């Protein structure tokens, strides 16, 4: 999966089966930690980069030993005789390592709204999570990136975040922290800020265009025309009850409504096989490569529909850092990598990335971020 | 035919899943579950260990796909597979299929696997894909179609794993149109429900889990006497209930069916429970869990406290093996089942496979006329062997279950092409 | 302790090797054999299925290597491994090592695995490598050192697989200095030689395979009566020979040792041979081989014609399984061994593991005082289980064999650091 | 291993286990064959290149169906019930496919002498193999590439090929076929031809320098100095009884002679662990990359010693084709890929390559090459 996860899972497995994972293993942990730290420095010529090829680049000194100790002290995974450490536990350990790797602090904490803030595609609904974000909003900038495209219509994005903004309306104006909240819609196309009354307003395109690689109108129209023709053939090729929904910088395969059983709800969405949505995503990806298009884009399978957006969240996060004069060692992103099979734009090449997979894990991560 | 003949590994351990694919707290959406099935290095051995026959077909189709002929006439491949299936039907052991797939189980019917593939491919046209080869779930669907298409003589008993197919998110039964399908089939065949929930002999507690289903019975299934064909097996194979004229569960006198069940003596039952209780007490202390031990007459459980505190998934896995090891260490051969549910742990001195055999013998039904609905994502084949006692459909959501039951209700109708994926479309 | 207790799968089949690593016609040099051991996807399961304990250690060392600490103090890892080995010595079943490695076999001695690693690493400094982690062969060497370092009380019996260790390229014995080592050890301990070659009871034919060794005996081993300690077991476990004053093999009266061997009745012996002959006749016709069938009293063989015509390696593999299947089909449980030699095929109604147990009981030697020299590259663990009957050294060339024997001859000498890789250096 | 081998092995496995590999599988074989032929043409955008990434490029139309039929007719591998087709059999099938893919003929057949012509590092000794080479020498050019470096000393190379040249002295002068025999020593540094009396003579460097990328003297001396320092540290690091042997365009770690047992031969070579020779080869490979050296070279572990040569056999085979005015679709190379773990310069990017692993397999391949 994420290669360095598998790198430590396998090592902990050997430590487990050799029957010593519950004894003093600091000789191994510190030997990896200095490998990690020698990757902070000279990352082009580390021994780490030799062992794992797709390590990427570390923006920080990762205290992997302290992280293992802290996580093992709480959950006691080395006390299990038959269940060795898992992929998800190592995922936590690195998440914790990256957090404590910011003792110098961060100035920008960014969320993937679709993966962490909206449960099951709904609107924000978590008074506990909104508590922690508001707390952190006082100490740093907090931006929220989402693939939802409602042009620059600030009211439409507000509906998805109203409970969260309603929390801001009681804990984040007396100290003026609302100035540090940012929302990036359309992956990287529509930017919003917060006003005194906890209400989203649009930052006009002229004020931040200078930080985004310009993309021609005809090239964004060619990306959507290419995808249009692709989806049309997918519809014909699989007998889909669906049609194409074209927006200004997006285009989507949306399922139709069809009847149910009279005893159930009398209308439901047509269901597109996950296989057919995967077939279409890379079908589109290949025709875009066939036309030698360099513009950043994003084609994803999301639940019951498919969307092609001209811009990707990776570009948005760079745009936010170029905008607020922050460089990568002082900002991190929170998303869920189980949700995009598309390895492209792994977010970790732009900022520190935390991998969380349910609201409880997200709150655990923020709790750690408050206590620095 | 009997419990001693079924290949049960009650103290066995499946190969460790470092990716905890059945941790529903992390893999909590159909989107995530479909993505892991693409990464072979993430889910291959876990899937094969749940149905090696399906994986057998997936790999054959993957190679038809990469060789670029899956959308051509592949009937030469399908029909020789079908010939092995027929041969296996006639020779459940020593067949060629058994040599290739040792845990293939039993074919109680001639599976038209060729007609199944053509049916599914005609509607969903998976061979029209250039870059996504047939998936595990798609072959799962195709195998369900083959077993349904093979029910020429019909069914006399249809059984559900309630925990896997009837309780959404573990809550009580709540699905009007599903109840409708069951109620109609109840008029054509015996229907039995198996669950691991042990409420001792307390019929009212089991009835609470099935209240909405039984209420549907009391409006369509009492006048035609179809209610006398409904059975409920609780504690996996310990407590048997039937229906009365008022759509109420009542215990069947154990003298009426005990002889069908392999006898376990009282001391062995309590010894298993006693050994588990000491294990679980040590697990609670070893990991500092906020959890409580719920012991029953023939079962014991590790349950989280309400506040709902959640026990680490790996701690639940660790405890199931600790229990099997100590039970092994005490040289106990009685059939039991110690399983890691999503969020709790249970040790039942019982077994759902033995439960079905009890229902089969009691109702004197031949295995060719039995069909089981379960979810092989939610149980270990060492506890419930694949294709041990009947045909078995694999469903993974209420929508698939409704489609299957709809097809079973239109069984052997000429103008009905069976469906196992969607109910409306 | 007896043949029925040894885990033998005589009709079993190892997982198919698509890379035919034991086809010595393609892998015909130490250079090629060392290269396949680097590609994990080429040789991992084949190597693990020959000694899962060695692979267990290789994987632990690979992770010490990639974590960049294998050249630091790794004694915390080694000593807890050593603690599991000691525990396994005290609890051959139910130990922690047995749970991790089910086919680990038996430790008849406390293995100083830590001292072994330090010994080998002091001389060869494998932890000084930045890019080649410890290899299968290197852990093989380290395990040999541990077993030799554990022979504190000495050895009373040393046994060789002649086919694997004493006949270069299948020709007769020809190695003066190897003979020298054996002859000296013959003066300190019993020495027995096991081979699958069945020349019926014809002592002269076996003597021809060992002529140069026996001639060395007739110049150093007759005056001190050490020759009465040499034994030869032919037909794997069917024909027993000893030495006289003139360095000549003679048959031991079967009444003197038959009771030590599990009895097989005459009809079962000939039935196995008859079934194999029909199989092999069909194999010769099916593939048009230029080959002949050599039947003995208790063995039958598929041999290529002299011209030397060579039978396809995969045809030999195909025939071994065909034979095991037909023997299974006739419900025959007698211990036999049907193996694919490099260039021929043999079905012996015998078994080399039973042969060693016969030598052990006959000479009344405890298993702690036995050591076997073989080559686990050249046999299936289902025929000869790893660590079943004694300590077992794994050698892969006469140079390693000489080094081992040299170390055994300097056993428990203070001023001698054992060696299992090189004889001169 | 070779990726397209594994591609067909796995497919034949599915055909095997589905119980149809002995029936008519021409729908699959021909479906791969047209995939192959659509790779002959438009090789940059084949479906094949999508499935397998490292396919390389095909110089010919591969009749994979006819090859399977011809090989199955002779050996009857589809008649086995329990031993499915193996890696080596598929290796043969492709070898046979490439041979019949030359119905248009070839004009240059090249050997790797170290891998196919010298058994166990000896001299040529195979009157049957020499028979087939002489037969083919009449129909095409035949060159022989070897890593042995004896400068331009023609007599030293003749010793390794004297039996073969002695065969030429009786069957290859009356028709003048000796003009078509070529020997390339030093991987790509020393070229030799044949005279009327079956004797090697050196083609002076001026006559073929124009077809080789020139390499500066100081850069070849830097490659050997880099390797010298590497081997010195390997000797110290592992207590080797060996020393360095420097040639003009090569440098080697050669083991010393050390005593044996008095009963054995009183002198033998010191033995260097294969692991330590592998450790050294890529140690050298990394320092050469650390110095950003572009010149083609070759560092290989060969038996009991290691050698670093400035030139590789891949370059020699290009030099021979550029010299004799032949392009790649009419020449093939015979070597053994089990013998170089170093994937670099896989020979198949320059010419058709046959993979053989014993003299019997080589003769079988040449027998096929005669019957076109
Ligand atoms: N570093 C991490 N990254 C991602 N997820 C984590 C991390 N640490 C813990 N989690 C997960 O978050 C979930 C919440 O843990 P839990 O509520 O037990 O402790 P907590 O969040 O610290 O709360 P408290 O501090 O009250 O114990 C757990 O299931 C755990 O698996
Ligand atoms: N295309 C090929 N590429 C590489 N090796 C091959 C190929 N075909 C056959 N071989 C191998 O060459 C060896 C020699 O085969 P064999 O001598 O049986 O037939 P042959 O060489 O054609 O001789 P004959 O024509 O007299 O039968 C065999 O072991 C076979 O595995």
Residue numbers in the entry:
A (entry chain D), D (entry chain D): 59 to 430
B (entry chain A), C (entry chain A): 10 to 316, 327 to 444
Task: Copy text from the publication.
Maintaining the optimal nucleotide balance required for normal cell proliferation is controlled by 5′-nucleotidases amongst other processes. All structures adopt a tetrameric assembly displaying a cross-like shape, in agreement with the quaternary solution structure.
Upon ATP binding, the enzyme undergoes a conformational change where CD and Cap domains in both β and δ subunits bend, thereby adopting a more closed conformation than that seen for the wild type (whole enzyme RMSD = 1.56 Å). Overall, the structures reveal that ATP activates the enzyme by triggering the departure of the LoopL430-Q444 which in turn induces the bending of the subunit thereby increasing the affinity for IMP.
